[PDB]
Design a binder for these strands. Sequence first.
RNA 1: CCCCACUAUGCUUAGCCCUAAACCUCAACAGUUAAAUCAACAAAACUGCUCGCCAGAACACUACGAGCCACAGCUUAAAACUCAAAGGACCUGGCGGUGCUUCAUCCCUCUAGAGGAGCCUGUUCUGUAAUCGAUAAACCCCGAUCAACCUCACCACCUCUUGCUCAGCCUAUAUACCGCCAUCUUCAGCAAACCCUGAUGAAGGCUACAAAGUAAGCGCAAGUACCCACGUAAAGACGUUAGGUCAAGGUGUAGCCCAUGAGGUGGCAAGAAAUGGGCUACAUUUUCUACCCCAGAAAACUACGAUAGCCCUUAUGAAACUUAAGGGUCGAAGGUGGAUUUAGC
Lengths: 132, 23, 195, 150, 304, 129
Amino acid sequence: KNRAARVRVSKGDKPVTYEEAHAPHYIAHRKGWLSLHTGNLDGEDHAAERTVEDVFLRKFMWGTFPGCLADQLVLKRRGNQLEICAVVLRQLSPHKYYFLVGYSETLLSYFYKCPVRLHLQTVPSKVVYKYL
Amino acid sequence: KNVLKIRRRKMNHHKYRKLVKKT
Amino acid sequence: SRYSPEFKDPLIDKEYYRKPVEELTEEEKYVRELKKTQLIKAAPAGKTSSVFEDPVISKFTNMMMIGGNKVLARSLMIQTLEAVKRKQFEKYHAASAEEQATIERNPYTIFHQALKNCEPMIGLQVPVPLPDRRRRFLAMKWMITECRDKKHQRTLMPEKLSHKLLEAFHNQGPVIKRKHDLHKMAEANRALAHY
Amino acid sequence: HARLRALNGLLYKALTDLLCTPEVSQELYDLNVELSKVSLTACRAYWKTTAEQNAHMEAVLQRSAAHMRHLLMSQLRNVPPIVFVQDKGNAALAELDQLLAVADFGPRLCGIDHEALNKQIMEYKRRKDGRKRAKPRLEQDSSLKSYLSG
Amino acid sequence: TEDFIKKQIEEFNIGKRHLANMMGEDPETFTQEDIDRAIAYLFPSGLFEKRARPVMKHPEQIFPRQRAIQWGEDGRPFHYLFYTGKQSYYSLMHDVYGMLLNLEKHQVIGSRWLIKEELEEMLVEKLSDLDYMQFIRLLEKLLTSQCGAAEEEFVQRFRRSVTLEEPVQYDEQGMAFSKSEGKRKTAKAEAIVYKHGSGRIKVNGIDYQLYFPITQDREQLMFPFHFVDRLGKHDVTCTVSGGGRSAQAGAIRLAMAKALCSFVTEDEVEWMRQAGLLTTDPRVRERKKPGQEGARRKFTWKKR
Amino acid sequence: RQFSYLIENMARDCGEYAHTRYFRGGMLTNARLLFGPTVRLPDLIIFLHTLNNIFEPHVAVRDAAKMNIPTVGIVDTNCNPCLITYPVPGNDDSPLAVHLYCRLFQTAITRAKEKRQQVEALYRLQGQK
RNA sequence: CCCCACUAUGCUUAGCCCUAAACCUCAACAGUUAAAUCAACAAAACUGCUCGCCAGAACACUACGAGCCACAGCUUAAAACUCAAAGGACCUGGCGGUGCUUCAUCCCUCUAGAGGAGCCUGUUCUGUAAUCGAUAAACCCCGAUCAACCUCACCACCUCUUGCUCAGCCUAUAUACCGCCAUCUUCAGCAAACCCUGAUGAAGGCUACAAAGUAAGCGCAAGUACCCACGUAAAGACGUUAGGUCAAGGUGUAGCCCAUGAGGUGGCAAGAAAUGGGCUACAUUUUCUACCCCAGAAAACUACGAUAGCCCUUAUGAAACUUAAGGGUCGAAGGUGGAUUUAGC
Ligand SMILES: [Mg+2]
Ligand SMILES: [Mg+2]
Ligand SMILES: [Mg+2]
Ligand SMILES: [Mg+2]
């Protein structure tokens, strides 16, 4: 039985977002990629470096906003820009959110030598696409 | 129904007749 | 199959389409009207409308084909037909006037008659009747297998096949012997037909 | 199933009655055909076979099948078409004998694999050279203890 | 709920006005097609599932037509067959039966019956296979009966069009000809057949007998003209590319047949179609699957 | 099935509801699941035929007794009137009798609705003055 | 058990014996069909009255006593020791050398193979100082989309001890797991939430001219990818085999810490074999050359047939008899291969 990235139904009560609900064979069919960069195109280069950067960015953002993230990040790259679009729960006071945004933007910009922007969209609670 | 009681009676009677024949 | 079940097999026969409307029955008229609305498969690369096309010979060539080498199988078949025709012409010219009437020079008629002679009416174990398609397939396969036998050394396939076809056309040869052996075995096992 | 069995029996009886009476057909009455079996799915009829007379009987039955179905519709009115099957014992034998007459013949131990075991023994020579089961109904359950605890 | 649908309709109207503003078009004449084009441009999505792409349709279409509760504030259901649980299906059956009764009182080619999913979408009600079969039987009994215009319209609501499937040009010298294209496996051919000719075929600028040494390919070329008895009466210039000898022969055969259809009679065209000379052959090479020797051959199951 | 069309048409004309098709299991005992908890069960069920097609009592009679819905019913000599709240002994197979029952029930329901409208209008008019 | 012959015996007469699944397994008589009809099954449920009988199983159609025309007999009929059950009816499952019906690639039919030969590779065994894992289908060109050193986890020898790491371990446990999958699956069902039936017992819930099942969820389906609507992919739930992986990585538990950690040099890797898969063949539908299908030669001891061996170059590399390519040399086994077996629409 295939097990990759699938959320197996247990009782009909566990909530899953849109991305968690869909299985890998639905990528590019019912769900887009969580990272968009020209690395994997024909003839382009530095795919490995972009992949490592994306993995580190996801880990760093997950560990920097503990429990704040309501979904996976979206890492867009335009030129040397780097936009991290995130969906965050409305738990913390906005002061902490702004502090973390400034911190993460400056630290990532100095760590990857590229202008990193962080766009946060807040939701009252984790969006439930269905229950499993 | 089963014949377990009948079978036990039959075995008892067979053993008794065998004992009578022996002695 | 890439063809949906709605698709129907094509009918390549010019006489069928040039037939006058008056001769058509009401049932045939309905068949034509139905075919006017049915999706038809593409004509296979094998069969055409050529007056020289022979489905028996085409099937024999396909059976002779090894590894999709249709060109070589067709070459062998046409060489066999040419060899049969040349041998029959030699016999015709070497024969007297009376015998020339009996000698047959049509390679296609000779081939069909030889295959018809090689067809076994009975088959097997319990002897059983054989349908027409099985009979034709058995005849063709027996002919091809006998011609492919190692008993003939350094003789090319056209010569061997022509020799066997001429033997069969005279109700002789190892293929007719094999048919007779099958008939005799079926006769012997007739006692088991109750199974 | 049993209803279909009774229907088959009724069809057999009706066909036998039609065969026996002379009113259905003088030909059929003179034939005196007897049925071995009748089975409904269409209806298959199997009659005992006596060659020339057998062929005549089959031909007359095939000719009169439509009239027999029409007469059966008078009774069980919704009667499926009746198929008569000639029972030449094993019909394969009869057809085979017919073809064989037609056809042309032309001119006239220990129960073991001792070898495998011997090979294995030679290979070996060369290489050299209960408990208690608790009852299901007696198994303890601590759910009530947990519920009473809190 | 119904109030929710009203709010969604108002939101959709406001959004339609805003989108018309964004695209710089008249809000009063911004059709649904313009909305779809604008959404596709502003929110591009390469997802293959069209239902997964962004959509800003009317709430009547986005929301399921099952509607809110089928009863008012008093709780009385609107439809008199509500308690059947299938009020749409049984209302439709009742109307069809009334039509049949009225027909009793008074007294195939380009369409098929909609599938059960289509009927379910029509009535926004779940239906069983036997229910669909019963409805189809009733509809077909209606059709077989002497149905009038109203009954024909009623049936056409369930009729679905069946998917059943030539120019003549003049060159610079006034030679009337027809041009067509054909494909077979990977070979692609373009053929030009002139109205008047003396049976000369030039393939890639080369005569066919010198371009197709195999007799089978020449027989394939002969097949279309021989079927219509027009051998030696037409001149053909055709160019083929790709594939092998037989694929090229088949592609040229299809292209020639399609082009020649412009000259023969309509009955001859139908005969050619029935002979299979016009159907593009979908038999193409099947991909090899992983873990298998070929397209269908599995690896040799290891001896046990 | 003989009177299904007539009964449905009469129910639609009188403003009430009809169920002449295969009575699915739990259309009354499980109505909350099959329609949503806000559904309103019928306040009166009228059986023009209390037997199903296998001559057993209609399951709707037992279900309505379970849900405490009164049942008016036309009981024939072979029917079982035990659980029917208001049995009406009479022929249920003759088309004339079924037509008479349908006419009587339609007329009673229509008269009741018209009288309700008239009384409501009169009360509202008098209360204002 | 079958066949044949034949006796007691079945028959008659007169006595005796007094048994049975002697069973409608329903005591006789009278009454009732109203309540609750009623544990279940059998055979609708009871009431009045009387006689007979029973009081856990087994010991026990027994022992003893008594009676009898009975003498290996029948009737009546215990107790001791022992057990925590014995038993009646039914339900579900398993099973039936179980009935019937209908199926599939189960068999035959078709094509090409394997099973015979050489070689490649994998496994197993032996050997060695010298990995591990997979290992019936579902291991066996498997982890590897790849080992001369490295890789490497193996071995021998040598060296280091806060070490690349706020250490480390490819040390034990896949029978603690995550992660990723195999298998049925070339499936269509599964699990919740209700509803109903059986007197509210275990359990059961289907009829389409429908008779208690069902609104949702998962899967099939649908949709999508490829060239269509077909096909192939993909998908394929729950569950089965404590299936595979602690050696992808992570991790529970347990263990090692001057060593089960870390580093360096050097090394295996052979065949007496068995077996799995593959390649090349045994040729004439072939071989060589031209050509890419209208040719010429070859065609059995100078044929077909090695991607093998031997030798010499070359490519890569620091390192090549190791690997690969090429040339030379050799022209071997083999002559279409048994049961059996693989694959295909
Ligand atoms: Mg005993
Ligand atoms: Mg009645
Ligand atoms: Mg008796
Ligand atoms: Mg008594």
